[PDB]
Amino acid sequence: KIRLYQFLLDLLRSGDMKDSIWWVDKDKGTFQFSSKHKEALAHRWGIQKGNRKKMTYQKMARALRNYGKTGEVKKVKKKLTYQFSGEVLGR
DNA sequence: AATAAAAGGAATGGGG
DNA sequence: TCCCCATTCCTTTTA
């Protein structure tokens, strides 16, 4: 089953939800969610996963924060903005 | 106040 | 057994 960080990277590469998520500095791997349209993207994540409940952006971001220690995704000090690691971007 | 982002502890659930 | 990789719930803090 796909991991959350890979789901997000795949969206960014395909452009499929460009109103919900976008690169800020693609060379650095920084990306940002839409304040008004992030819930549609969260819903898609939960449906892809087959989760019992409807996914919310809050719960998705709770999972994103768990990558901070291992490093795949880190929060950036800008609204709704995160950053993939170089390792993630290379693969 | 109303709204929103950010945080994380802790319990619970997936699939090995 | 017990880690993987979240999901869900609840509360707090900051803007």
Side-chain angles (χ1 to χ4, degrees), chain A residues 4 7-8 11-12 19-24 31-39 41-42 57 60-61 64 73 75 79-82 84:
Chain A
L4 175 54
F7 167 85
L8 296 174
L11 286 179
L12 282 159
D19 296 354
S20 295
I21 192 179
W22 47 80
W23 294 117
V24 179
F31 62 98
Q32 179 182 44
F33 294 97
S34 168
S35 176
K36 301 295 290 195
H37 298 116
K38 62 194 184 302
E39 293 300 340
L41 179 158
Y57 179 81
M60 188 185 76
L64 280 184
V73 183
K75 185 73 176 64
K79 193 175 166 193
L80 295 166
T81 304
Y82 293 82
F84 296 112

PDB file of all heavy atoms in Angstrom, chain A residues 4 7-8 11-12 19-24 31-39 41-42 57 60-61 64 73 75 79-82 84, chain B residues 5-6:
ATOM      1  N   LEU A   4       1.881   7.731   2.547  1.00  0.00           N
ATOM      2  CA  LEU A   4       1.356   9.085   2.378  1.00  0.00           C
ATOM      3  C   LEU A   4       2.321   9.979   1.613  1.00  0.00           C
ATOM      4  O   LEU A   4       1.897  10.747   0.748  1.00  0.00           O
ATOM      5  CB  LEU A   4       1.033   9.662   3.756  1.00  0.00           C
ATOM      6  CG  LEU A   4       0.581  11.122   3.793  1.00  0.00           C
ATOM      7  CD1 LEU A   4      -0.609  11.404   2.880  1.00  0.00           C
ATOM      8  CD2 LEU A   4       0.308  11.516   5.222  1.00  0.00           C
ATOM      9  N   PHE A   7       2.080   9.240  -2.051  1.00  0.00           N
ATOM     10  CA  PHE A   7       0.828   9.741  -2.606  1.00  0.00           C
ATOM     11  C   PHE A   7       0.932  11.221  -2.932  1.00  0.00           C
ATOM     12  O   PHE A   7       0.505  11.662  -4.005  1.00  0.00           O
ATOM     13  CB  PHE A   7      -0.272   9.466  -1.583  1.00  0.00           C
ATOM     14  CG  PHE A   7      -1.567  10.171  -1.835  1.00  0.00           C
ATOM     15  CD1 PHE A   7      -2.529   9.646  -2.693  1.00  0.00           C
ATOM     16  CD2 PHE A   7      -1.850  11.353  -1.172  1.00  0.00           C
ATOM     17  CE1 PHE A   7      -3.748  10.312  -2.866  1.00  0.00           C
ATOM     18  CE2 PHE A   7      -3.053  12.015  -1.356  1.00  0.00           C
ATOM     19  CZ  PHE A   7      -3.992  11.495  -2.201  1.00  0.00           C
ATOM     20  N   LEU A   8       1.494  12.003  -2.023  1.00  0.00           N
ATOM     21  CA  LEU A   8       1.625  13.441  -2.252  1.00  0.00           C
ATOM     22  C   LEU A   8       2.619  13.749  -3.367  1.00  0.00           C
ATOM     23  O   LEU A   8       2.349  14.588  -4.230  1.00  0.00           O
ATOM     24  CB  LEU A   8       2.061  14.123  -0.965  1.00  0.00           C
ATOM     25  CG  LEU A   8       1.075  14.043   0.195  1.00  0.00           C
ATOM     26  CD1 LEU A   8       1.681  14.625   1.460  1.00  0.00           C
ATOM     27  CD2 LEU A   8      -0.257  14.700  -0.127  1.00  0.00           C
ATOM     28  N   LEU A  11       0.979  13.044  -6.654  1.00  0.00           N
ATOM     29  CA  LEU A  11       0.061  14.108  -7.069  1.00  0.00           C
ATOM     30  C   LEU A  11       0.820  15.281  -7.654  1.00  0.00           C
ATOM     31  O   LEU A  11       0.417  15.865  -8.662  1.00  0.00           O
ATOM     32  CB  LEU A  11      -0.781  14.619  -5.901  1.00  0.00           C
ATOM     33  CG  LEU A  11      -1.909  13.740  -5.385  1.00  0.00           C
ATOM     34  CD1 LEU A  11      -2.581  14.438  -4.208  1.00  0.00           C
ATOM     35  CD2 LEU A  11      -2.922  13.437  -6.469  1.00  0.00           C
ATOM     36  N   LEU A  12       1.892  15.684  -6.990  1.00  0.00           N
ATOM     37  CA  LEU A  12       2.651  16.824  -7.475  1.00  0.00           C
ATOM     38  C   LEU A  12       3.251  16.548  -8.844  1.00  0.00           C
ATOM     39  O   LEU A  12       3.323  17.447  -9.682  1.00  0.00           O
ATOM     40  CB  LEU A  12       3.736  17.172  -6.469  1.00  0.00           C
ATOM     41  CG  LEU A  12       3.197  17.933  -5.255  1.00  0.00           C
ATOM     42  CD1 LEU A  12       4.148  17.801  -4.098  1.00  0.00           C
ATOM     43  CD2 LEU A  12       2.947  19.382  -5.574  1.00  0.00           C
ATOM     44  N   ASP A  19      -5.228  22.476  -7.856  1.00  0.00           N
ATOM     45  CA  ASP A  19      -5.865  23.484  -7.022  1.00  0.00           C
ATOM     46  C   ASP A  19      -5.767  23.176  -5.536  1.00  0.00           C
ATOM     47  O   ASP A  19      -6.162  24.016  -4.722  1.00  0.00           O
ATOM     48  CB  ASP A  19      -7.349  23.615  -7.387  1.00  0.00           C
ATOM     49  CG  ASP A  19      -7.571  24.114  -8.791  1.00  0.00           C
ATOM     50  OD1 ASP A  19      -6.581  24.472  -9.473  1.00  0.00           O
ATOM     51  OD2 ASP A  19      -8.750  24.153  -9.205  1.00  0.00           O
ATOM     52  N   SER A  20      -5.294  21.989  -5.162  1.00  0.00           N
ATOM     53  CA  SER A  20      -5.194  21.590  -3.762  1.00  0.00           C
ATOM     54  C   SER A  20      -3.771  21.561  -3.228  1.00  0.00           C
ATOM     55  O   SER A  20      -3.587  21.658  -2.011  1.00  0.00           O
ATOM     56  CB  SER A  20      -5.769  20.183  -3.558  1.00  0.00           C
ATOM     57  OG  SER A  20      -7.152  20.139  -3.825  1.00  0.00           O
ATOM     58  N   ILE A  21      -2.780  21.379  -4.091  1.00  0.00           N
ATOM     59  CA  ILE A  21      -1.389  21.212  -3.671  1.00  0.00           C
ATOM     60  C   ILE A  21      -0.496  21.682  -4.821  1.00  0.00           C
ATOM     61  O   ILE A  21      -0.829  21.495  -6.000  1.00  0.00           O
ATOM     62  CB  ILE A  21      -1.114  19.737  -3.285  1.00  0.00           C
ATOM     63  CG1 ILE A  21       0.221  19.595  -2.562  1.00  0.00           C
ATOM     64  CG2 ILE A  21      -1.177  18.814  -4.512  1.00  0.00           C
ATOM     65  CD1 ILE A  21       0.537  18.153  -2.144  1.00  0.00           C
ATOM     66  N   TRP A  22       0.641  22.303  -4.486  1.00  0.00           N
ATOM     67  CA  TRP A  22       1.558  22.778  -5.520  1.00  0.00           C
ATOM     68  C   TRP A  22       2.967  22.858  -4.966  1.00  0.00           C
ATOM     69  O   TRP A  22       3.169  23.007  -3.765  1.00  0.00           O
ATOM     70  CB  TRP A  22       1.119  24.144  -6.059  1.00  0.00           C
ATOM     71  CG  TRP A  22       0.778  25.126  -4.991  1.00  0.00           C
ATOM     72  CD1 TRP A  22       1.638  25.877  -4.238  1.00  0.00           C
ATOM     73  CD2 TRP A  22      -0.536  25.447  -4.536  1.00  0.00           C
ATOM     74  NE1 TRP A  22       0.932  26.652  -3.346  1.00  0.00           N
ATOM     75  CE2 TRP A  22      -0.406  26.410  -3.517  1.00  0.00           C
ATOM     76  CE3 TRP A  22      -1.820  25.021  -4.906  1.00  0.00           C
ATOM     77  CZ2 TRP A  22      -1.515  26.951  -2.862  1.00  0.00           C
ATOM     78  CZ3 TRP A  22      -2.905  25.568  -4.270  1.00  0.00           C
ATOM     79  CH2 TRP A  22      -2.750  26.521  -3.258  1.00  0.00           C
ATOM     80  N   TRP A  23       3.944  22.803  -5.874  1.00  0.00           N
ATOM     81  CA  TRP A  23       5.313  23.110  -5.490  1.00  0.00           C
ATOM     82  C   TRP A  23       5.435  24.580  -5.159  1.00  0.00           C
ATOM     83  O   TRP A  23       4.846  25.433  -5.827  1.00  0.00           O
ATOM     84  CB  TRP A  23       6.285  22.791  -6.606  1.00  0.00           C
ATOM     85  CG  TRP A  23       6.426  21.364  -6.974  1.00  0.00           C
ATOM     86  CD1 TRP A  23       6.115  20.786  -8.176  1.00  0.00           C
ATOM     87  CD2 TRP A  23       6.989  20.323  -6.170  1.00  0.00           C
ATOM     88  NE1 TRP A  23       6.440  19.461  -8.159  1.00  0.00           N
ATOM     89  CE2 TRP A  23       6.976  19.150  -6.938  1.00  0.00           C
ATOM     90  CE3 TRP A  23       7.516  20.270  -4.871  1.00  0.00           C
ATOM     91  CZ2 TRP A  23       7.450  17.937  -6.459  1.00  0.00           C
ATOM     92  CZ3 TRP A  23       7.996  19.046  -4.400  1.00  0.00           C
ATOM     93  CH2 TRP A  23       7.957  17.911  -5.194  1.00  0.00           C
ATOM     94  N   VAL A  24       6.240  24.881  -4.151  1.00  0.00           N
ATOM     95  CA  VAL A  24       6.694  26.234  -3.875  1.00  0.00           C
ATOM     96  C   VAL A  24       8.082  26.450  -4.465  1.00  0.00           C
ATOM     97  O   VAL A  24       8.308  27.342  -5.278  1.00  0.00           O
ATOM     98  CB  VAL A  24       6.662  26.511  -2.355  1.00  0.00           C
ATOM     99  CG1 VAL A  24       7.172  27.918  -2.067  1.00  0.00           C
ATOM    100  CG2 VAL A  24       5.238  26.347  -1.808  1.00  0.00           C
ATOM    101  N   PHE A  31       6.551  22.249  -0.837  1.00  0.00           N
ATOM    102  CA  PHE A  31       5.219  22.200  -1.414  1.00  0.00           C
ATOM    103  C   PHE A  31       4.230  22.734  -0.395  1.00  0.00           C
ATOM    104  O   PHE A  31       4.509  22.782   0.802  1.00  0.00           O
ATOM    105  CB  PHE A  31       4.825  20.800  -1.863  1.00  0.00           C
ATOM    106  CG  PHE A  31       4.761  19.770  -0.758  1.00  0.00           C
ATOM    107  CD1 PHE A  31       3.554  19.439  -0.168  1.00  0.00           C
ATOM    108  CD2 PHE A  31       5.895  19.091  -0.338  1.00  0.00           C
ATOM    109  CE1 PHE A  31       3.476  18.486   0.804  1.00  0.00           C
ATOM    110  CE2 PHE A  31       5.813  18.128   0.656  1.00  0.00           C
ATOM    111  CZ  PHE A  31       4.605  17.827   1.191  1.00  0.00           C
ATOM    112  N   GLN A  32       3.067  23.145  -0.895  1.00  0.00           N
ATOM    113  CA  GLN A  32       2.080  23.821  -0.075  1.00  0.00           C
ATOM    114  C   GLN A  32       0.684  23.342  -0.432  1.00  0.00           C
ATOM    115  O   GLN A  32       0.382  23.111  -1.612  1.00  0.00           O
ATOM    116  CB  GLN A  32       2.221  25.333  -0.262  1.00  0.00           C
ATOM    117  CG  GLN A  32       1.233  26.158   0.536  1.00  0.00           C
ATOM    118  CD  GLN A  32       1.415  27.635   0.254  1.00  0.00           C
ATOM    119  OE1 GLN A  32       1.574  28.054  -0.894  1.00  0.00           O
ATOM    120  NE2 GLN A  32       1.406  28.429   1.302  1.00  0.00           N
ATOM    121  N   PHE A  33      -0.157  23.206   0.593  1.00  0.00           N
ATOM    122  CA  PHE A  33      -1.557  22.880   0.404  1.00  0.00           C
ATOM    123  C   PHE A  33      -2.386  24.153   0.304  1.00  0.00           C
ATOM    124  O   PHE A  33      -2.063  25.183   0.901  1.00  0.00           O
ATOM    125  CB  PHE A  33      -2.083  22.070   1.587  1.00  0.00           C
ATOM    126  CG  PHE A  33      -1.461  20.716   1.717  1.00  0.00           C
ATOM    127  CD1 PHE A  33      -0.415  20.504   2.582  1.00  0.00           C
ATOM    128  CD2 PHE A  33      -1.927  19.648   0.973  1.00  0.00           C
ATOM    129  CE1 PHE A  33       0.146  19.248   2.720  1.00  0.00           C
ATOM    130  CE2 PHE A  33      -1.366  18.399   1.105  1.00  0.00           C
ATOM    131  CZ  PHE A  33      -0.335  18.206   1.999  1.00  0.00           C
ATOM    132  N   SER A  34      -3.512  24.039  -0.395  1.00  0.00           N
ATOM    133  CA  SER A  34      -4.497  25.100  -0.500  1.00  0.00           C
ATOM    134  C   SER A  34      -5.308  25.206   0.771  1.00  0.00           C
ATOM    135  O   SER A  34      -5.904  24.226   1.217  1.00  0.00           O
ATOM    136  CB  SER A  34      -5.464  24.764  -1.629  1.00  0.00           C
ATOM    137  OG  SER A  34      -6.594  25.613  -1.603  1.00  0.00           O
ATOM    138  N   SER A  35      -5.417  26.414   1.307  1.00  0.00           N
ATOM    139  CA  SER A  35      -6.258  26.559   2.483  1.00  0.00           C
ATOM    140  C   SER A  35      -7.695  26.120   2.196  1.00  0.00           C
ATOM    141  O   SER A  35      -8.312  25.402   2.998  1.00  0.00           O
ATOM    142  CB  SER A  35      -6.216  28.001   2.963  1.00  0.00           C
ATOM    143  OG  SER A  35      -7.104  28.172   4.051  1.00  0.00           O
ATOM    144  N   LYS A  36      -8.237  26.522   1.049  1.00  0.00           N
ATOM    145  CA  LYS A  36      -9.639  26.275   0.758  1.00  0.00           C
ATOM    146  C   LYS A  36      -9.913  24.928   0.104  1.00  0.00           C
ATOM    147  O   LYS A  36     -11.058  24.475   0.136  1.00  0.00           O
ATOM    148  CB  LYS A  36     -10.196  27.386  -0.130  1.00  0.00           C
ATOM    149  CG  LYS A  36     -10.094  28.774   0.488  1.00  0.00           C
ATOM    150  CD  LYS A  36     -10.943  28.945   1.747  1.00  0.00           C
ATOM    151  CE  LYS A  36     -12.426  28.947   1.436  1.00  0.00           C
ATOM    152  NZ  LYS A  36     -13.267  29.450   2.564  1.00  0.00           N
ATOM    153  N   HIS A  37      -8.916  24.282  -0.499  1.00  0.00           N
ATOM    154  CA  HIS A  37      -9.153  23.072  -1.281  1.00  0.00           C
ATOM    155  C   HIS A  37      -8.382  21.857  -0.790  1.00  0.00           C
ATOM    156  O   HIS A  37      -8.372  20.822  -1.467  1.00  0.00           O
ATOM    157  CB  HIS A  37      -8.884  23.353  -2.749  1.00  0.00           C
ATOM    158  CG  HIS A  37      -9.800  24.388  -3.278  1.00  0.00           C
ATOM    159  ND1 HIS A  37      -9.402  25.622  -3.737  1.00  0.00           N
ATOM    160  CD2 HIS A  37     -11.148  24.385  -3.323  1.00  0.00           C
ATOM    161  CE1 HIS A  37     -10.470  26.313  -4.099  1.00  0.00           C
ATOM    162  NE2 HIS A  37     -11.542  25.590  -3.844  1.00  0.00           N
ATOM    163  N   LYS A  38      -7.769  21.935   0.385  1.00  0.00           N
ATOM    164  CA  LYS A  38      -7.007  20.800   0.884  1.00  0.00           C
ATOM    165  C   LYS A  38      -7.900  19.648   1.317  1.00  0.00           C
ATOM    166  O   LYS A  38      -7.455  18.499   1.298  1.00  0.00           O
ATOM    167  CB  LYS A  38      -6.095  21.248   2.021  1.00  0.00           C
ATOM    168  CG  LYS A  38      -6.810  21.803   3.251  1.00  0.00           C
ATOM    169  CD  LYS A  38      -5.821  22.529   4.160  1.00  0.00           C
ATOM    170  CE  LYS A  38      -6.445  23.023   5.454  1.00  0.00           C
ATOM    171  NZ  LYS A  38      -7.595  23.932   5.296  1.00  0.00           N
ATOM    172  N   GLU A  39      -9.146  19.909   1.716  1.00  0.00           N
ATOM    173  CA  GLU A  39      -9.974  18.806   2.193  1.00  0.00           C
ATOM    174  C   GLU A  39     -10.289  17.814   1.085  1.00  0.00           C
ATOM    175  O   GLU A  39     -10.363  16.616   1.345  1.00  0.00           O
ATOM    176  CB  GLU A  39     -11.263  19.300   2.842  1.00  0.00           C
ATOM    177  CG  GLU A  39     -11.079  20.076   4.147  1.00  0.00           C
ATOM    178  CD  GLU A  39     -10.402  19.325   5.293  1.00  0.00           C
ATOM    179  OE1 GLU A  39     -10.359  18.088   5.314  1.00  0.00           O
ATOM    180  OE2 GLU A  39      -9.927  20.007   6.218  1.00  0.00           O
ATOM    181  N   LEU A  41      -8.332  16.883  -1.232  1.00  0.00           N
ATOM    182  CA  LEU A  41      -7.153  16.036  -1.349  1.00  0.00           C
ATOM    183  C   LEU A  41      -7.090  15.045  -0.193  1.00  0.00           C
ATOM    184  O   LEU A  41      -6.830  13.850  -0.399  1.00  0.00           O
ATOM    185  CB  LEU A  41      -5.920  16.955  -1.431  1.00  0.00           C
ATOM    186  CG  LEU A  41      -4.558  16.283  -1.527  1.00  0.00           C
ATOM    187  CD1 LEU A  41      -3.567  17.251  -2.117  1.00  0.00           C
ATOM    188  CD2 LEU A  41      -4.057  15.803  -0.166  1.00  0.00           C
ATOM    189  N   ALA A  42      -7.381  15.503   1.026  1.00  0.00           N
ATOM    190  CA  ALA A  42      -7.455  14.590   2.160  1.00  0.00           C
ATOM    191  C   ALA A  42      -8.501  13.506   1.934  1.00  0.00           C
ATOM    192  O   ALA A  42      -8.249  12.328   2.205  1.00  0.00           O
ATOM    193  CB  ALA A  42      -7.753  15.368   3.440  1.00  0.00           C
ATOM    194  N   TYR A  57      -8.089  16.811   6.513  1.00  0.00           N
ATOM    195  CA  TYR A  57      -6.744  17.366   6.416  1.00  0.00           C
ATOM    196  C   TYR A  57      -6.041  17.294   7.766  1.00  0.00           C
ATOM    197  O   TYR A  57      -4.852  16.990   7.842  1.00  0.00           O
ATOM    198  CB  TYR A  57      -6.801  18.816   5.909  1.00  0.00           C
ATOM    199  CG  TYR A  57      -5.416  19.378   5.851  1.00  0.00           C
ATOM    200  CD1 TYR A  57      -4.576  19.099   4.778  1.00  0.00           C
ATOM    201  CD2 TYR A  57      -4.928  20.150   6.883  1.00  0.00           C
ATOM    202  CE1 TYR A  57      -3.279  19.548   4.758  1.00  0.00           C
ATOM    203  CE2 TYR A  57      -3.649  20.637   6.873  1.00  0.00           C
ATOM    204  CZ  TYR A  57      -2.804  20.337   5.806  1.00  0.00           C
ATOM    205  OH  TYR A  57      -1.504  20.779   5.781  1.00  0.00           O
ATOM    206  N   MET A  60      -4.653  13.877   8.196  1.00  0.00           N
ATOM    207  CA  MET A  60      -3.564  13.650   7.256  1.00  0.00           C
ATOM    208  C   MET A  60      -2.308  14.360   7.731  1.00  0.00           C
ATOM    209  O   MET A  60      -1.205  13.803   7.678  1.00  0.00           O
ATOM    210  CB  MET A  60      -4.002  14.088   5.858  1.00  0.00           C
ATOM    211  CG  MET A  60      -3.005  13.705   4.763  1.00  0.00           C
ATOM    212  SD  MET A  60      -3.434  14.343   3.156  1.00  0.00           S
ATOM    213  CE  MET A  60      -2.936  16.019   3.438  1.00  0.00           C
ATOM    214  N   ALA A  61      -2.454  15.594   8.208  1.00  0.00           N
ATOM    215  CA  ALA A  61      -1.301  16.326   8.717  1.00  0.00           C
ATOM    216  C   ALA A  61      -0.759  15.710  10.001  1.00  0.00           C
ATOM    217  O   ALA A  61       0.454  15.794  10.264  1.00  0.00           O
ATOM    218  CB  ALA A  61      -1.649  17.804   8.891  1.00  0.00           C
ATOM    219  N   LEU A  64       1.494  13.307   8.648  1.00  0.00           N
ATOM    220  CA  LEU A  64       2.665  13.967   8.083  1.00  0.00           C
ATOM    221  C   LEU A  64       3.671  14.329   9.151  1.00  0.00           C
ATOM    222  O   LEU A  64       4.886  14.231   8.923  1.00  0.00           O
ATOM    223  CB  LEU A  64       2.272  15.243   7.362  1.00  0.00           C
ATOM    224  CG  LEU A  64       1.722  15.116   5.969  1.00  0.00           C
ATOM    225  CD1 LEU A  64       1.483  16.508   5.373  1.00  0.00           C
ATOM    226  CD2 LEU A  64       2.666  14.328   5.032  1.00  0.00           C
ATOM    227  N   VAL A  73       9.472  13.957   5.233  1.00  0.00           N
ATOM    228  CA  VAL A  73       8.752  15.212   5.080  1.00  0.00           C
ATOM    229  C   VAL A  73       8.972  15.997   6.358  1.00  0.00           C
ATOM    230  O   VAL A  73       8.811  15.453   7.456  1.00  0.00           O
ATOM    231  CB  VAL A  73       7.241  14.996   4.865  1.00  0.00           C
ATOM    232  CG1 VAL A  73       6.540  16.319   4.648  1.00  0.00           C
ATOM    233  CG2 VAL A  73       6.976  14.046   3.727  1.00  0.00           C
ATOM    234  N   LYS A  75       7.979  19.900   8.234  1.00  0.00           N
ATOM    235  CA  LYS A  75       7.222  21.137   8.179  1.00  0.00           C
ATOM    236  C   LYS A  75       8.160  22.320   7.962  1.00  0.00           C
ATOM    237  O   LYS A  75       9.230  22.402   8.573  1.00  0.00           O
ATOM    238  CB  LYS A  75       6.464  21.311   9.489  1.00  0.00           C
ATOM    239  CG  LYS A  75       5.543  22.500   9.491  1.00  0.00           C
ATOM    240  CD  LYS A  75       4.311  22.247   8.635  1.00  0.00           C
ATOM    241  CE  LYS A  75       3.323  23.396   8.701  1.00  0.00           C
ATOM    242  NZ  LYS A  75       3.902  24.633   8.134  1.00  0.00           N
ATOM    243  N   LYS A  79       2.841  28.964   5.984  1.00  0.00           N
ATOM    244  CA  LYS A  79       1.509  28.394   6.083  1.00  0.00           C
ATOM    245  C   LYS A  79       1.337  27.187   5.167  1.00  0.00           C
ATOM    246  O   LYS A  79       1.553  27.272   3.956  1.00  0.00           O
ATOM    247  CB  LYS A  79       0.498  29.480   5.708  1.00  0.00           C
ATOM    248  CG  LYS A  79      -0.925  29.114   6.057  1.00  0.00           C
ATOM    249  CD  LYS A  79      -1.901  30.252   5.785  1.00  0.00           C
ATOM    250  CE  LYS A  79      -3.344  29.761   5.816  1.00  0.00           C
ATOM    251  NZ  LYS A  79      -4.287  30.768   5.256  1.00  0.00           N
ATOM    252  N   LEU A  80       0.908  26.071   5.757  1.00  0.00           N
ATOM    253  CA  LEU A  80       0.512  24.869   5.019  1.00  0.00           C
ATOM    254  C   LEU A  80       1.633  24.312   4.145  1.00  0.00           C
ATOM    255  O   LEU A  80       1.378  23.606   3.169  1.00  0.00           O
ATOM    256  CB  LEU A  80      -0.771  25.092   4.211  1.00  0.00           C
ATOM    257  CG  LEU A  80      -2.017  25.369   5.051  1.00  0.00           C
ATOM    258  CD1 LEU A  80      -3.166  25.909   4.193  1.00  0.00           C
ATOM    259  CD2 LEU A  80      -2.462  24.127   5.783  1.00  0.00           C
ATOM    260  N   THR A  81       2.881  24.600   4.497  1.00  0.00           N
ATOM    261  CA  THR A  81       4.029  24.259   3.677  1.00  0.00           C
ATOM    262  C   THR A  81       4.905  23.200   4.342  1.00  0.00           C
ATOM    263  O   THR A  81       5.170  23.263   5.549  1.00  0.00           O
ATOM    264  CB  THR A  81       4.833  25.528   3.399  1.00  0.00           C
ATOM    265  OG1 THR A  81       3.975  26.499   2.782  1.00  0.00           O
ATOM    266  CG2 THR A  81       5.965  25.270   2.444  1.00  0.00           C
ATOM    267  N   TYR A  82       5.388  22.264   3.519  1.00  0.00           N
ATOM    268  CA  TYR A  82       6.205  21.136   3.938  1.00  0.00           C
ATOM    269  C   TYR A  82       7.333  20.962   2.926  1.00  0.00           C
ATOM    270  O   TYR A  82       7.354  21.596   1.869  1.00  0.00           O
ATOM    271  CB  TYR A  82       5.353  19.862   3.985  1.00  0.00           C
ATOM    272  CG  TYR A  82       4.287  19.862   5.067  1.00  0.00           C
ATOM    273  CD1 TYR A  82       3.061  20.490   4.880  1.00  0.00           C
ATOM    274  CD2 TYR A  82       4.507  19.232   6.278  1.00  0.00           C
ATOM    275  CE1 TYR A  82       2.086  20.487   5.874  1.00  0.00           C
ATOM    276  CE2 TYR A  82       3.534  19.229   7.283  1.00  0.00           C
ATOM    277  CZ  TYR A  82       2.336  19.863   7.078  1.00  0.00           C
ATOM    278  OH  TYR A  82       1.396  19.844   8.082  1.00  0.00           O
ATOM    279  N   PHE A  84       9.891  17.760   1.191  1.00  0.00           N
ATOM    280  CA  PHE A  84      10.402  16.396   1.061  1.00  0.00           C
ATOM    281  C   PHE A  84      11.914  16.362   1.218  1.00  0.00           C
ATOM    282  O   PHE A  84      12.618  17.302   0.853  1.00  0.00           O
ATOM    283  CB  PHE A  84      10.119  15.831  -0.325  1.00  0.00           C
ATOM    284  CG  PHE A  84       8.676  15.672  -0.661  1.00  0.00           C
ATOM    285  CD1 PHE A  84       8.081  16.449  -1.637  1.00  0.00           C
ATOM    286  CD2 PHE A  84       7.911  14.689  -0.046  1.00  0.00           C
ATOM    287  CE1 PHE A  84       6.769  16.266  -1.974  1.00  0.00           C
ATOM    288  CE2 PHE A  84       6.598  14.507  -0.396  1.00  0.00           C
ATOM    289  CZ  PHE A  84       6.018  15.298  -1.344  1.00  0.00           C
TER     290      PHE A  84
ATOM    291  P    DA B   5      -6.378  26.586   7.555  1.00  0.00           P
ATOM    292  OP1  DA B   5      -5.987  27.042   6.204  1.00  0.00           O
ATOM    293  OP2  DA B   5      -7.203  25.369   7.747  1.00  0.00           O
ATOM    294  O5'  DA B   5      -5.036  26.383   8.368  1.00  0.00           O
ATOM    295  C5'  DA B   5      -4.124  27.424   8.395  1.00  0.00           C
ATOM    296  C4'  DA B   5      -3.124  27.226   9.493  1.00  0.00           C
ATOM    297  O4'  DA B   5      -3.805  27.213  10.765  1.00  0.00           O
ATOM    298  C3'  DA B   5      -2.315  25.932   9.416  1.00  0.00           C
ATOM    299  O3'  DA B   5      -0.949  26.303   9.358  1.00  0.00           O
ATOM    300  C2'  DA B   5      -2.716  25.157  10.678  1.00  0.00           C
ATOM    301  C1'  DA B   5      -3.207  26.255  11.602  1.00  0.00           C
ATOM    302  N9   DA B   5      -4.208  25.873  12.598  1.00  0.00           N
ATOM    303  C8   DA B   5      -5.461  25.376  12.381  1.00  0.00           C
ATOM    304  N7   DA B   5      -6.150  25.192  13.488  1.00  0.00           N
ATOM    305  C5   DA B   5      -5.293  25.616  14.491  1.00  0.00           C
ATOM    306  C6   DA B   5      -5.417  25.692  15.899  1.00  0.00           C
ATOM    307  N6   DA B   5      -6.508  25.330  16.566  1.00  0.00           N
ATOM    308  N1   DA B   5      -4.364  26.157  16.593  1.00  0.00           N
ATOM    309  C2   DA B   5      -3.275  26.535  15.927  1.00  0.00           C
ATOM    310  N3   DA B   5      -3.052  26.527  14.621  1.00  0.00           N
ATOM    311  C4   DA B   5      -4.103  26.046  13.955  1.00  0.00           C
ATOM    312  P    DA B   6       0.229  25.256   9.070  1.00  0.00           P
ATOM    313  OP1  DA B   6       1.368  26.086   8.635  1.00  0.00           O
ATOM    314  OP2  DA B   6      -0.225  24.194   8.167  1.00  0.00           O
ATOM    315  O5'  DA B   6       0.499  24.688  10.527  1.00  0.00           O
ATOM    316  C5'  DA B   6       1.037  25.566  11.487  1.00  0.00           C
ATOM    317  C4'  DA B   6       1.120  24.891  12.814  1.00  0.00           C
ATOM    318  O4'  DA B   6      -0.207  24.722  13.338  1.00  0.00           O
ATOM    319  C3'  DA B   6       1.724  23.489  12.764  1.00  0.00           C
ATOM    320  O3'  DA B   6       3.058  23.501  13.280  1.00  0.00           O
ATOM    321  C2'  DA B   6       0.763  22.655  13.615  1.00  0.00           C
ATOM    322  C1'  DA B   6      -0.132  23.711  14.268  1.00  0.00           C
ATOM    323  N9   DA B   6      -1.491  23.284  14.576  1.00  0.00           N
ATOM    324  C8   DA B   6      -2.461  22.901  13.695  1.00  0.00           C
ATOM    325  N7   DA B   6      -3.607  22.598  14.271  1.00  0.00           N
ATOM    326  C5   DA B   6      -3.367  22.812  15.615  1.00  0.00           C
ATOM    327  C6   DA B   6      -4.171  22.651  16.760  1.00  0.00           C
ATOM    328  N6   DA B   6      -5.443  22.242  16.719  1.00  0.00           N
ATOM    329  N1   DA B   6      -3.614  22.926  17.950  1.00  0.00           N
ATOM    330  C2   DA B   6      -2.349  23.350  17.986  1.00  0.00           C
ATOM    331  N3   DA B   6      -1.499  23.533  16.977  1.00  0.00           N
ATOM    332  C4   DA B   6      -2.072  23.232  15.818  1.00  0.00           C
TER     333       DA B   6
END
